[PDB]
Amino acid sequence: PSMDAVVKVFCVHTEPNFSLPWQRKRQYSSGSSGFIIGGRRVLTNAHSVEHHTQVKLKKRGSDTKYLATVLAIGTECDIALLTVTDDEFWEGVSPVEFGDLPALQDAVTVVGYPIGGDTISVTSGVVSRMEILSYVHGSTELLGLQIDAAINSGNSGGPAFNDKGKCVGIAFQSLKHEDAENIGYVIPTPVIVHFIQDYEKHDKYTGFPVLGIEWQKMENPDLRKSMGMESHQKGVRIRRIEPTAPESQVLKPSDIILSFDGVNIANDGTVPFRHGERIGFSYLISQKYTGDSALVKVLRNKEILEFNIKLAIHKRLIPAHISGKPPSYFIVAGFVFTTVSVPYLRSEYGKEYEFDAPVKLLEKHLHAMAQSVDEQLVVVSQVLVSDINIGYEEIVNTQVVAFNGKPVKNLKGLAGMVENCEDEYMKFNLDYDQIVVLDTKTAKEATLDILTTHCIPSAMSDDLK
Amino acid sequence: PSMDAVVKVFCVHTEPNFSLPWQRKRQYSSGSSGFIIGGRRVLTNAHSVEHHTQVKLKKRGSDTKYLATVLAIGTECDIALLTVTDDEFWEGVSPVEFGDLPALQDAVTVVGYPIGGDTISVTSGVVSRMEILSYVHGSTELLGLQIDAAINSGNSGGPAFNDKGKCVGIAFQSLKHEDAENIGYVIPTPVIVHFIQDYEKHDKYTGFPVLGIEWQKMENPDLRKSMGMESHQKGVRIRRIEPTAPESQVLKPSDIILSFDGVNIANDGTVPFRHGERIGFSYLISQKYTGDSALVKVLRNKEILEFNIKLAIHKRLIPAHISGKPPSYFIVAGFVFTTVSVPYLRSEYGKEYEFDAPVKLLEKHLHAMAQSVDEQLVVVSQVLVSDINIGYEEIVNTQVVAFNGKPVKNLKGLAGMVENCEDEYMKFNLDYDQIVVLDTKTAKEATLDILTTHCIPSAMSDDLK
Amino acid sequence: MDAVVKVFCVHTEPNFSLPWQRKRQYSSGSSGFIIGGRRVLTNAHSVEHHTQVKLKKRGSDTKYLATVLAIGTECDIALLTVTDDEFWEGVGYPIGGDTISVTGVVSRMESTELLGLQGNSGGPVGIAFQYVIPTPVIVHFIQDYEKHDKYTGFPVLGIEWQKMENPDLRKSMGMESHQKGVRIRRIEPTAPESQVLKPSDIILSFDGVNIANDGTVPFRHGERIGFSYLISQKYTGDSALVKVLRNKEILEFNIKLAIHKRLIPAHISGKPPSYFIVAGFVFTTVSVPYLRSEYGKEYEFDAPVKLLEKHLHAMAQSVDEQLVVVSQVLVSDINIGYEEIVNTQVVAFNGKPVKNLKGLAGMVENCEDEYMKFNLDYDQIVVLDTKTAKEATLDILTTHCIPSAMSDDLKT
Incomplete structure (x- = not known):
């Protein structure tokens, strides 16, 4: 008792x-x-x-x-x-x-x-x-x-x-x-x-x-x-x-x-x-x-x-948790952009993620400090396969660092730059000195049918609407 | 102490x-x-x-x-x-x-x-x-x-x-x-x-x-x-x-x-x-x-x-036990009729009978209520192989639902309908939309030699005599 | 080659x-x-x-x-x-x-x-697979x-x-x-x-x-x-x-x-599975892919006996008859006390027999009564206030990231 x-x-x-x-x-x-x-x-x-x-x-x-x-x-x-x-x-x-x-x-x-x-x-x-x-x-x-x-x-x-x-x-x-x-x-x-x-x-x-x-x-x-x-x-x-x-x-x-x-x-x-x-x-x-x-x-x-x-x-650049909130994501042309947190790394790489995740990400997890109150590590999580993104299907968990010459600070910023993009092309600078180029008009048009194919309710989490 | x-x-x-x-x-x-x-x-x-x-x-x-x-x-x-x-x-x-x-x-x-x-x-x-x-x-x-x-x-x-x-x-x-x-x-x-x-x-x-x-x-x-x-x-x-x-x-x-x-x-x-x-x-x-x-x-x-x-x-349709009494059975032409209880299911299908017994029987075990004080689930338990029952030897644990057009309520009822059957044929309606047909005269005559072959003292348990 | x-x-x-x-x-x-x-x-x-x-x-x-x-x-x-x-x-x-x-062996029949x-399933005899x-x-x-x-x-x-x-x-x-x-x-x-x-x-x-x-x-x-x-x-x-x-x-x-036409279809020819939702009650139709997904490879032994009986022994009595179940209850205040209902057949809605999923979905939409009364298997009932149950649905979908209350084939 x-x-x-x-x-x-x-x-x-x-x-x-x-x-x-x-x-x-x-x-x-x-x-x-x-x-x-x-x-x-x-x-x-x-x-x-x-x-x-x-x-x-x-x-x-x-x-x-x-x-x-x-x-x-x-x-x-x-x-x-x-x-x-x-x-x-x-x-x-x-x-x-x-x-x-x-x-x-x-x-x-x-x-x-x-x-x-x-x-x-x-x-x-x-x-x-x-x-x-x-x-x-x-x-x-x-x-x-x-x-x-x-x-x-x-x-x-x-x-x-x-x-x-x-x-x-x-x-x-x-x-x-x-x-x-x-x-x-x-x-x-x-x-x-x-x-x-x-x-x-x-x-x-x-x-x-x-x-x-x-x-x-x-x-x-x-x-x-x-x-x-x-x-x-x-x-x-x-x-x-x-x-x-x-x-x-x-x-x-x-x-x-x-x-x-x-x-x-x-x-x-x-x-x-x-x-x-x-x-x-x-x-x-x-x-x-x-x-x-x-x-x-x-x-x-x-x-x-x-x-x-x-x-x-x-405030951790790669947060240990996100307070039970829904993880943020944004999709265009089947490219799934999300941010890196510990639950993301755990769900992507399992219990041993501190040894199995990419070293680029582990560096930021173990050693990086946020340089600003709203900074986020933004990555291409995966590519939902479709004609518009032929040749890109192998890209997984790779940081996006710039969009049409401008640095990416966080997911909302990237979602804004993609929405207001008037250039003929969308040019993403990725880690490992890679670029992703998409025709702006045809890529925005391709998104909806991909959402449908994968039963994705919306192209973005509510926090970006 | x-x-x-x-x-x-x-x-x-x-x-x-x-x-x-x-x-x-x-x-x-x-x-x-x-x-x-x-x-x-x-x-x-x-x-x-x-x-x-x-x-x-x-x-x-x-x-x-x-x-x-x-x-x-x-x-x-x-x-x-x-x-x-x-x-x-x-x-x-x-x-x-x-x-x-x-x-x-x-x-x-x-x-x-x-x-x-x-x-x-x-x-x-x-x-x-x-x-x-x-x-x-x-x-x-x-x-x-x-x-x-x-x-x-x-x-x-x-x-x-x-x-x-x-x-x-x-x-x-x-x-x-x-x-x-x-x-x-x-x-x-x-x-x-x-x-x-x-x-x-x-x-x-x-x-x-x-x-x-x-x-x-x-x-x-x-x-x-x-x-x-x-x-x-x-x-x-x-x-x-x-x-x-x-x-x-x-x-x-x-x-x-x-x-x-x-x-x-x-x-x-x-x-x-x-x-x-x-x-x-x-x-x-x-x-x-x-x-x-x-x-x-x-x-x-x-x-x-x-x-x-x-x-x-x-009163359970499929009883959990039968009070140490002997299980009831009735034989004609090598067809062994008995009733379904938990000891019967255990002895037929082992400890896991609640998963290995036929689903027709499991339904009645888990969900059926007796509709009358004397209702019993009657089954053909097995067929004692003999010439009179050629073509029927594979029938196992299958409910008998009617005899010559009349519903079967319990084993004693079925034993009575077989004894007083005056029709040329005995027609059993079984589950799964099967019928068993036997010539009445030759089937009753075949029974005794089958009993002998299998050392069966009597064609029925005493409770049916 | x-x-x-x-x-x-x-x-x-x-x-x-x-x-x-x-x-x-x-x-x-x-x-x-x-x-x-x-x-x-x-x-x-x-x-x-x-x-x-x-x-x-x-x-x-x-x-x-x-x-x-x-x-x-x-x-x-x-x-x-x-x-x-x-x-x-x-x-x-x-x-x-x-x-x-x-x-390996080619010949060797039995x-x-x-x-x-x-490597590799698909090639050219006929079409190998492995x-x-x-x-x-x-x-x-x-x-x-x-x-x-x-x-x-x-x-x-x-x-x-x-x-x-x-x-x-x-x-x-x-x-x-x-x-x-x-x-x-x-x-x-x-x-x-x-x-x-x-x-x-x-x-x-x-x-x-x-x-x-x-x-x-x-x-x-x-x-x-x-x-x-x-x-x-x-x-x-x-x-x-x-x-x-x-x-x-x-x-x-x-x-x-x-x-x-099987009552519980062995597959659905790659069509999407159908569902209808109201007040967190997820209704769907029993197929073999459903039973397999719900209960594993031993589903013919682990599924509920009421469903196994349908799977092994029931014939469809109509060309569009489906076996409709409450699949699960997405818990919310509206459905308090109902949360343990899992894979249980719906037989009637407000006195009328349920023949298939689209039928049930139609009866709910047109329900003008005060209460929604589902007759379930095992002699159970589910009663919901019609006004508040319809009103509760949207937030439950939001919570579970469900895009609409029903699959497209039920918009039809």
């Missing part, structure tokens, strides 16, 4: 097809775990209800499935917040109550449901370490608890209790470990508290802020001396700054970040966390709210400066 | 051959578990003594096997009630005593004997859920306990104890789970009490009543409005009524059942069961005794009606 | 489970060969759902866009052409190769069949095209029959000892012969060929074959003389032969 607050989550999903962005896949149902908390609220994983079209909740002792409402989705922290109108669902359950951030080697008990099973499952372990990690690959890294108990579909989203019967967070199945390694994570209470308090204040999820920099350790003493650091000072060198984090352009490459909100940062980027414990300084940042300001102290040209910087969320 | 009341059941079985209904299979012995209770009584599974010709009981500390008496067999609840004349068997054992219906996640300890072993085995688990389930496939669904401990031959029939040393029911091996899933059932004490009290009152088993209806949920609000339901009312729509449950013909299709014996029924067919627990409304029905009456409240034509309905057992 | 061409095929095939969509393009390579009359021969399965077939001659650098002339589904043969005259100026190809190959058991497609099938296929100017398939006698091997059965129906044949069990209502033939007729002969008690006719010395072989040799629209015993008398009918 209290087992009666631990519910099963039935979710009907309607996933976009990122490879065929005019399609939604067949409806399917998934089950996971979740739990009732104070104030007529239920907590589960964000991944358990992504692309939801209906959510239902089932208590362990009753056949009845209750229609639920999704209140907010925190994708970066993998939390969803639900409610239920039916008062019968709430009646007679004592809500889960939250405990303090656990100590290492503290006992933890994870309560949930097996895969495809409707009976309670109970899994035991210890907190093996504190960690900063992504809950969505390629997305912002947050505080987490690592536990020596494996988590699998089913129990992820159930509560994790300390020996005092208090919940210390939401179970989370590891993305980077095989199920037999018996390692799992718990989304901890300060992350949970960040997400609920964020919703309670803004009536919406507003994300987790980042500073918008990459950094390099300062552990070599000649490096420190050569940039004016006094022998008591320590910190990290700024390698690069996101062009699209404008509040951070007050910072500059090769600044030495000395402290953040007063907390002293070491040469390896760690800050003190608790007795005998050190953690990366990003936990100081991600515990703030988007829009919060932070005191950053740097060494610049052997002199100390202090900046108050408004913090924002990270 | 108290291990000394947990006995081994040795049973000699003489099973009918449903594929060759003139034969009894070779005697064989099976062992299972059972336990002594108050009043010179032993409890075991019904399946452990089906087709019994002798039962013996062995206590764990003594070589001696005691000749037992079968008092009653409750097939639907899988319980057999035995006694023993020898007073030495009873002397010095403290009888098992029964506890209350357990709560979810309560500890349960199952005591029995391994397969082919005569030493005590002890298995531990928790009650994982309350359930309504069939203990014989295709037979009436009853209250049961699901436990996270697997049960296998051997221990099924042993007692299940709560931590207070009280028995909360009889172990039961799952029909729908592989042994490695570690899931089993316990026939609970209110079912046990139903069966003993039933015997103690009628000097015989009288079964578990059903209402005789199929129903459809009422969870859609337009469905509810369109049939006059006020916003506070809830219940289920009657889809169909068994023709042979005449006390229920007072009900009518599209009645909305609102409550049963006062208990309010929800739109999903659940009723409250305990604190925070809901179960299907059939538990209200099957806890009554055959012959009991029940108050049923329906909405009919937007108006409330209340009926007092005498409850009876379910 | 310079008349053996390479055949690149790009396929776009429908989703029978989601009939508003087309699966992703995929490509096949095959062979083919040129014959007389500006005509190219290949396999059917190698150009099924072709969106573009181009052809490439031996040793040539040019791929010519083809036009497929006829696809013979029942017999796995197709036939293409190319409008450019340069293509017609004056054994097959390995996968991924543009060079001719010439190859709608209705041709019955011969045991056995060799024989020439007695090709010629029927070609001569069918060369006559109808399209493919019409192979005719059938729309009857089921039972052997007449048992003496007493024969005597009871008046068959003299020398007479042999098969007894009609049932006749397809949508066959022309359902007029003139009757149940329990004994079919004795077909175009003067005597039919045995077990349904076979002579074939070669020492070998017989089922009489359906005779009927499949004819062409659609041909006449045939069918001689029967009825009430102990001999009658001979001249019957114009026709294509089989």
Whole structure:
């Protein structure tokens, strides 16, 4: 106990097809775990209800499935917040109550449901370490608890209790470990508290802020001396700054970040966390709210400066997810133009896309920064075969970089240049020094019959209409 | 302890051959578990003594096997009630005593004997859920306990104890789970009490009543409005009524059942069961005794009606079992006529008969209702090859629907029409628009020599003589 | 050998489970060969759902866009052409190769069949596929095209029959000892012969060929074959003389032969699948491609028994009768409580029998009643408020990226 607050989550999903962005896949149902908390609220994983079209909740002792409402989705922290109108669902359950951030080697008990099973499952372990990690690959890294108990579909989203019967967070199945390694994570209470308090204040999820920099350790003493650091000072060198984090352009490459909100940062980027414990300084940042300001102290040209910087969320050139929105696409003459995101790469190349995708794309995934707030990697995804595009059918996942001499910044820009093209020819500059040339008049005329052939409702996603 | 009341059941079985209904299979012995209770009584599974010709009981500390008496067999609840004349068997054992219906996640300890072993085995688990389930496939669904401990031959029939040393029911091996899933059932004490009290009152088993209806949920609000339901009312729509449950013909299709014996029924067919627990409304029905009456409240034509309905057992067109009776058959000219039951289908098509039997038969198994109290599905089972039936040898498991223009209602009817046939020809209308024609005089004369060839004692089962 | 061409095929095939969509393009390579009359021969399965077939001659650098002339589904043969005259100026190809190959056992022997058991499919004997497609099938296929100017398939006698091997059965129906044949069990209502033939007729002969008690006719010395072989040799629209015993008398009918109309069609000749949607209820018609797409290759065991019964045993009672099901329910507030309805037959709409998909779609459009009441199989009903159910449809289509509430054939 209290087992009666631990519910099963039935979710009907309607996933976009990122490879065929005019399609939604067949409806399917998934089950996971979740739990009732104070104030007529239920907590589960964000991944358990992504692309939801209906959510239902089932208590362990009753056949009845209750229609639920999704209140907010925190994708970066993998939390969803639900409610239920039916008062019968709430009646007679004592809500889960939250405990303090656990100590290492503290006992933890994870309560949930097996895969495809409707009976309670109970899994035991210890907190093996504190960690900063992504809950969505390629997305912002947050505080987490690592536990020596494996988590699998089913129990992820159930509560994790300390020996005092208090919940210390939401179970989370590891993305980077095989199920037999018996390692799992718990989304901890300060992350949970960040997400609920964020919703309670803004009536919406507003994300987790980042500073918008990459950094390099300062552990070599000649490096420190050569940039004016006094022998008591320590910190990290700024390698690069996101062009699209404008509040951070007050910072500059090769600044030495000395402290953040007063907390002293070491040469390896760690800050003190608790007795005998050190953690990366990003936990100081991600515990703030988007829009919060932070005191950053740097060494610049052997002199100390202090900046108050408004913090924002990270904008990735190739986004880790697109918030459940439909992927954007545009078609002309059977050429399918779309943008590159992580779900696109996963759907095109499978689980190992970080090794099987084209190196041109991997470069941009691993290393490129967006140069503008609206920049997108635009590609020819595929060519829908037809007479108008004879000779081009082999083109797959190749960046479009220019149209009739003008650079392509994003998909909407390219859709605009194709619509307003008055030249005799449409000349696309592709990657690998390729060009695609189409007669403007005959290519626009060819589009409709291709749409029909492939049952494409429209030549573009609504966001471009 | 108290291990000394947990006995081994040795049973000699003489099973009918449903594929060759003139034969009894070779005697064989099976062992299972059972336990002594108050009043010179032993409890075991019904399946452990089906087709019994002798039962013996062995206590764990003594070589001696005691000749037992079968008092009653409750097939639907899988319980057999035995006694023993020898007073030495009873002397010095403290009888098992029964506890209350357990709560979810309560500890349960199952005591029995391994397969082919005569030493005590002890298995531990928790009650994982309350359930309504069939203990014989295709037979009436009853209250049961699901436990996270697997049960296998051997221990099924042993007692299940709560931590207070009280028995909360009889172990039961799952029909729908592989042994490695570690899931089993316990026939609970209110079912046990139903069966003993039933015997103690009628000097015989009288079964578990059903209402005789199929129903459809009422969870859609337009469905509810369109049939006059006020916003506070809830219940289920009657889809169909068994023709042979005449006390229920007072009900009518599209009645909305609102409550049963006062208990309010929800739109999903659940009723409250305990604190925070809901179960299907059939538990209200099957806890009554055959012959009991029940108050049923329906909405009919937007108006409330209340009926007092005498409850009876379910009569299935294709019966789930035939109570250990011998299967009926009738032979003429080497044509073997028999009726279709579940044991017949199992013996003809194996464990997967619900996928391997002819679709014509599966339809009737899954969906047909008996149209009369004595209706039977009659089939040609096989043709015993002989000159008189040349050209017909391939006919297998095909329904007989008419004889000389008259419909076949059951096997006895067909046996009567063949005996009193005065026409020159016997013309059987079979399924798939086939006919079998035989010269009446020569076919009746051919029968005896076929019986002899196949060592068939008689042309019919005794029930047709 | 310079008349053996390479055949690149790009396929776009429908989703029978989601009939508003087309699966992703995929490509096949095959062979083919040129014959007389500006005509190219290949396999059917190698150009099924072709969106573009181009052809490439031996040793040539040019791929010519083809036009497929006829696809013979029942017999796995197709036939293409190319409008450019340069293509017609004056054994097959390995996968991924543009060079001719010439190859197991050949010999080694051992709608209705041709019955011969045991890079690159398409080439030139007859048409290989990967056995060799024989020439007695090709010629029927070609001569069918060369006559109808399209493919019409192979005719059938729309009857089921039972052997007449048992003496007493024969005597009871008046068959003299020398007479042999098969007894009609049932006749397809949508066959022309359902007029003139009757149940329990004994079919004795077909175009003067005597039919045995077990349904076979002579074939070669020492070998017989089922009489359906005779009927499949004819062409659609041909006449045939069918001689029967009825009430102990001999009658001979001249019957114009026709294509089989199956209630659950074995395929739909590459036409798109049809669907109709209202308030998230997806209605469609049961075909074998549907059952296969819904339930896998074991569909004859995993599909619901109600549908399996129709598939194995039902005859269409009308020429346009279809088996209409609720395929699935696209969940939305309008259809709350109905979401578990899957592949269940619709039998009536507001009291009136449903005969086919277009019929059902018409009744919904013209429904002026307050409620829409669908009688489903398993004695179920679906009730929706007519005004709000029609109003809810559009957003459900939007959510699922469905272009309209129905397939084009239902706009008709």
